[PDB]
Amino acid sequence: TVLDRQYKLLTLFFHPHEPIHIKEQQEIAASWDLEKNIGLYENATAVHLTIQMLHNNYQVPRGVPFTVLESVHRFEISVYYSLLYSAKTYDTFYKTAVFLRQHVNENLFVNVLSVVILHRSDTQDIRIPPIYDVFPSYFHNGEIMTTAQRITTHGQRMLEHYPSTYVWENNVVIRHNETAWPYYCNTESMPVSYFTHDVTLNALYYNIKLAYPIWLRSDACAIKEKRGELFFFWNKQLLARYYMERLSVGLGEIPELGLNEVEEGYVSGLLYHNGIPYPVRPNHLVLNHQTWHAEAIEEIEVYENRIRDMIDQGFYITNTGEHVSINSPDSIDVLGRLIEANVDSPNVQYYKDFISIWKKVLGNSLVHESVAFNGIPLVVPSVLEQYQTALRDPAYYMIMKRVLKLFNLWHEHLPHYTTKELSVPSVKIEKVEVDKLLTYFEYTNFNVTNHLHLNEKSVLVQRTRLNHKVFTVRVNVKSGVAKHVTVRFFLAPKYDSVGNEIPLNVNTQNFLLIDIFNYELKEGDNLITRVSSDNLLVTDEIDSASVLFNKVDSALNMKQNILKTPRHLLLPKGRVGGMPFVLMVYISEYHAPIDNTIRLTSDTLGFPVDRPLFPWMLTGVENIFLQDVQIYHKPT
């Protein structure tokens, strides 16, 4: 019965903005009544709250932007999640989903239903469609969407007048985004536009926040996920990759964010479904004038000073006034939880969310204090207030760099690793060599037909993306005696924006983990010959909505999880003629430990680059090797 259930849940994601077209779903929406069917829900309080909200009309109006950073939106989405998750039977769950689809905003319903499907036992096999297919308007420029609407409604008669559009195959018409948006931010935004505007990266951020919502309290499974450590590690990896891209395109180090003025602005060029332009941050934005920006920055400074005091003093304050030490090396998780100010933080009243205030300030979304129903505020969020568009703005990377400065301060106070924790007896690496590192640009097609308001075709968008050829890394190692070992590869830049070789201690923060795997080392001489195509950290493209629908309706793979980095974004572009980089191979013992499942050997994720490392403490540690490589770009 998997196929039919998946088909129905897909039909729930066919046209969010438009109303229900399938008749029996209308019958269910008109027939079901929560009041009399309270007995089928475990959480009766959620049922009462939902009934009250739906009766008083105290809900976010339909056809309006939705943001989780607003309090009332969080309350509404949490209540709906509690109601949906408390469904005893799958039938009750589906019937509540239909009713909410009828009586709930599109974005909120999609998000809550996806979260419920991911975290429900009865729906551990259902596959949810990609976000960039349900709402294409968050990943393509407004001109593209308007042209799509025109070419569709024209009946493809004036389409042949358009030279940009073309018919690649029957029933599909494709455009070019190569020639468009001549007006753009420029500054530091254009050279890295092939990485920051990538659809897959924003989709990955959205899916990550689907797996770990800020408004959802962890269960036994989510309590072993080490939420804070994942936050820190993922932010570090993203910032290291972004810095590598900037060095590749010659833009320099990530600008440091102050408290007086921000020089770089952002113009999104995106449009909401209704047609409201996004807020724009001007260049040379002033933060020390008579504006709400000043008050927001003062609150941000207070909260960050509280975090700094907690880090330095070595303990945090409970909600009653007790001191809880965080000086042990295993307190990184609670530190991250406190910094994030999620619902799992011990004390959110004193440790508040300054990152959201940073996002509000640097989004320059004019607060007009407008409310509907004498209730829910009406907000026009900027790109930074949406996880599916935040990564397009450099300000996000600047803010995360500040948070990573806080994290580095905390890690600095920790004792440095010893020659016993960081050494494996009688394992010496001889030589490490990669076959080649080449990158090239290629074309890809995305389906944006779900935005078209069909009455009674399939428009696609062509985009340019980076990719790399398969590469093999071969290392020879002395093994001493037989062992079961783990090998980790790290990649870092070798020269900074000016030309001086970066010391290893500084590079410790710029090392990007690209592969980790097990091996059984024999006695004597060995050979590791890892191929990039075998790594499980990076995955291939997930099947599109159309492909999944075809494979389902016509009637598995475990190499496509929503919480993995796309393969084509693993390797930096480099330069034509070669760009130098540093590879680091580290071998350690194997210390023995589907929607949201990731686990490796029990140890800090960034080991051994989480703490600062110095050359003088690597003498006597032979199982770590630092080689130099060159990354090339194939021009086309």
Ligand X SMILES: *[C@@H]1O[C@H](CO)[C@@H](O[C@@H]2O[C@H](CO)[C@@H](O[C@@H]3O[C@H](CO[C@H]4O[C@H](CO[C@H]5O[C@H](CO)[C@@H](O)[C@H](O)[C@@H]5O)[C@@H](O)[C@H](O[C@H]5O[C@H](CO)[C@@H](O)[C@H](O)[C@@H]5O)[C@@H]4O)[C@@H](O)[C@H](O[C@H]4O[C@H](CO)[C@@H](O)[C@H](O)[C@@H]4O[C@H]4O[C@H](CO)[C@@H](O)[C@H](O)[C@@H]4O[C@H]4O[C@H](CO)[C@@H](O)[C@H](O)[C@@H]4O)[C@@H]3O)[C@H](O)[C@H]2NC(C)=O)[C@H](O)[C@H]1NC(C)=O
Ligand Y SMILES: *[C@@H]1O[C@H](CO)[C@@H](O[C@@H]2O[C@H](CO)[C@@H](O)[C@H](O)[C@H]2NC(C)=O)[C@H](O)[C@H]1NC(C)=O
Question: H/E/C letters for each residue in 399-428?
Answer: HHHHHHHHHHHHHHCCCCCCCCCCCCCCCE
- 349 sits near ligand X (criterion: CB under 6 A): yes
Interaction residues for ligand X, span 30-49 (CB under 6 A): 43, 45-46, 49
Q: What whole-number distance in Å separates Cα of residue 228 and Cα of residue 156?
A: 51
- In degrees and rounded to multiples of 5, residue 301 shows phi and psi of -65, -40
> Please, what is the minimum distance in Å from the beta carbon of residue 285 to Cu ion?
9
Rule CB under 8 A: choose which of 431, 453, 484, 551 binds a copy of itself.
453
Asked whether position 66 contacts Cu ion by CB under 5 A, the answer is no
CB 527 to a copy of itself: min, Å = 40
Nearer to Cu ion, 366 or 527 (CB): 366
Q: Which is nearer to ligand Y, 16 or 493 (CB)?
A: 16
Q: Is 290 a residue that touches a copy of itself (CB under 8 A)?
A: yes
Identify residue 237 by its one-letter amino acid code: Q
Token pair belonging to 518: 């097990």
Strands 579-589 and 483-493: antiparallel
- Minimum CB separation of residue 41 from ligand Y in Å reads 31
Q: For residues 518-537, which are near ligand Y according to CB under 6 A?
A: none
Query: Any residues with CB less than 8 A from the CB of 540 and at least 6 apart, and which?
Result: 559, 560, 566, 567
Among 121, 260, 320, 455, binds ligand X (CB under 6 A): 320
Which of 33, 312, 421, 501 touches a copy of itself (CB under 8 A)? 312
Binding of a copy of itself by 328 (CB under 8 A): no
What does the alpha-carbon distance between residue 467 and residue 444 come to, in Å, rounded to a whole number?
11
Cβ-Cβ contacts under 8 Å for 31 (sequence gap 6 or more): none
Among 31, 37, 291, 327, indicate the residue that binds ligand X (CB under 6 A).
327
With CB under 5 to 8 Å by kind, the binding choice for 529 among Cu ion, ligand Y, ligand X, none is none
Contact between 157 and Cu ion per CB under 5 A: no
449 binds, among ligand Y, ligand X, a copy of itself, none (CB under 5 to 8 A by kind): ligand Y
Tokens representing residue 50 in the block: 């939902």
C-alpha 570/C-alpha 510 separation (Å) is 14
Helix axes 106-118, 71-85, angle to 10 degrees: 50
**Rounded Cα distance, 246 and 38, in Å:** 56
Q: Is 105 in the site for ligand X (CB under 6 A)?
A: no
The token duo for 569 is 């974004």
CA 590/CA 587 separation, integer angstroms: 9
| Residue 135 binds Cu ion (CB under 5 A) | yes
Q: Which stretch binds Cu ion (CB under 5 A): 78-86, 207-215, 286-294, 399-407?
A: 286-294
Identity at 384, one-letter amino acid code: L
Stretch that binds a copy of itself, among 178-186, 386-394, 460-468, 625-633 (CB under 8 A): 178-186
- The answer to whether residue 450 forms part of the interface with ligand Y (CB under 6 A) is yes
Least Å from the CB of residue 214 to ligand X: 10
Q: Which of residues 455-474 bind a copy of itself (CB under 8 A)?
A: 455-456
Q: Smallest distance, Å, CB 74 to ligand X? A: 9
Tokens 């007896």 belong to 425
Minimum distance from residue 378 beta carbon to ligand X (Å): 20
Verify cis geometry, omega within 30 degrees of 0, for the bond prior to 329.
Answer: no
Any contact of residue 458 with ligand Y (CB under 6 A)? yes
Supply the minimum distance, in Å, between the C-beta of residue 629 and a copy of itself.
Answer: 22
Residue numbers 21-60 binding a copy of itself by CB under 8 A? none
Q: Which partner, Cu ion, ligand X, a copy of itself, none, binds residue 378 by CB below 5 to 8 Å per kind?
A: a copy of itself
Q: Is 163 exposed, middle or buried (0-12, 13-18, 19+ CB in 10 A)?
A: exposed
By CB under 6 A, is residue 78 in contact with ligand X? yes
Give the residue among 143, 35, 100, 175 at the shortest CA–CA distance from 461.
175
Nearest-CA neighbor of 148 among 169, 168, 176, 170? 176
Q: Which of 170, 171, 366, 616 binds a copy of itself (CB under 8 A)?
A: 366
Residues of the chain by 3-state class (helix, strand, coil), percent to 5:
35, 20, 45
* Sole window of 265-273, 391-399, 546-554, 625-633 interacting with a copy of itself (rule: CB under 8 A): 265-273
The window from 58-66, 170-178, 277-285, 601-609 that contacts Cu ion (CB under 5 A) reads 277-285
Per-residue tokens: 57 = 């009309």
Angstrom CA distances, 61 to 65, 376, 378, stand at: 9, 8, 9
Q: Rounded to the nearest whole angstrom, what is the least distance from the CB of residue 90 to ligand X in the complex? A: 18
For position 316 contacting Cu ion by CB under 5 A, the verdict is no
Q: What DSSP assignment string belongs to 537-555?
A: SEE-PPPPHHHHHHHHHH-
172 makes contact, choosing from ligand Y, ligand X, Cu ion, none, with CB < 5 to 8 Å by partner type, with ligand Y
CB of 44 to ligand X, least distance (A): 8
Residue 550 binds to a copy of itself (criterion: CB under 8 A): no
182 binds a copy of itself (CB under 8 A): yes
Over 185-227, what HEC string results? CCCCCCCCHHHHCCHHHHHHHHHHHHHCCCCCCCCHHHHCCCH
Give 17 or 209: the residue with its C-beta nearer to a copy of itself.
Answer: 17
Q: How far is CA 148 from CA 156, 173, 175, 203, 468, in A?
A: 10, 9, 9, 22, 31
Which segment (63-71, 127-135, 307-315, 623-631) binds Cu ion by CB under 5 A?
A: 127-135
Nearer to ligand Y, 523 or 553 (CB): 553
Contact track, ligand Y, 157-196, x by CB under 6 A: --------------xx------------------------
For tokens 């490589």, the residue is 629
Q: How far is the CB of 95 from ligand Y (least distance, A)?
A: 22
Min dist. Cβ of residue 137 to Cu ion (A): 3
Cβ closest to Cu ion, residue 154 vs residue 413:
154
User: Measuring CA to CA, how many Å separate 101 from each of 105, 125, 386?
Assistant: 8, 22, 21
The listed partner (Cu ion, ligand Y, a copy of itself, none) that binds 135, CB under 5 to 8 Å by sort, is: Cu ion
Which residues contribute to the site for Cu ion (CB under 5 A)? 135, 137, 273, 284, 289, 451
